[PDB]
């Protein structure tokens, strides 16, 4: 009865929270480094 | 032989890569159709073609 509001409704950074397993999702905080190595066949020569 | 005139050049990319890593393009106009020889006056820069 006296439960209050679960973290899904109260947590910072607009995140969503779920169970099985317990997870936080989509916290809008910090940044994400990425490296991508696309095949050399995707290019075409600048002289063409 | 074919004679060029009004030619000019660009180097879209270059690297020190031992194996012809530099590429260049020359615009031209010429007096006829034919076959034309190319060479580099500077010994520090070898040309593949």
Question: Would you tell me which residues 19-48 of chain A have a C-beta closer than 8 angstroms to some C-beta of chain B?
Answer: 45-47
- How far is residue A26's CA from residue A7's CA, in Å, rounded to a whole number? 14
Q: How was this structure determined?
A: cryo-EM
Name the region of A4 (left: φ>0; alpha: ψ -120 to 50; beta: rest). left
User: CA angle at residue B38 from B33 to B39, to 5 degrees?
Assistant: 165
Pairing of strands A23-25, A16-18: antiparallel
| Residues from B in contact with A at Cβ < 8 Å | 12-13, 23, 25
Residue located via tokens 């169970």: A19
What is the stated resolution of the deposited model, in angstroms? Answer: 3.5
Query: What is the nearest CA distance from B10 to chain A, expressed in angstroms?
Result: 10
Both ends of chain B: CA-CA distance in Å?
19
- How far is residue B46's CA from residue A14's CA, in Å, rounded to a whole number? 60
């Amino acid at each position: 009865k006296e439960r209050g509001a679960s973290l899904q409704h109260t947590a910072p950074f607009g995140c969503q929270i779920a169970t099985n397993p317990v997870r936080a999702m989509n916290c809008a905080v910090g940044n994400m480094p990425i490296s991508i190595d696309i095949p050399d066949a995707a290019f075409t020569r600048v002289v063409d | 032989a074919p004679s060029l005139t009004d030619m000019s050049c660009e180097v879209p990319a270059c690297t020190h890569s031992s194996d012809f890593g530099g590429v260049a393009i020359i615009k031209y106009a010429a007096s006829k159709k034919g076959k034309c020889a190319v060479h580099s006056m500077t010994n520090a820069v070898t040309i593949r073609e």
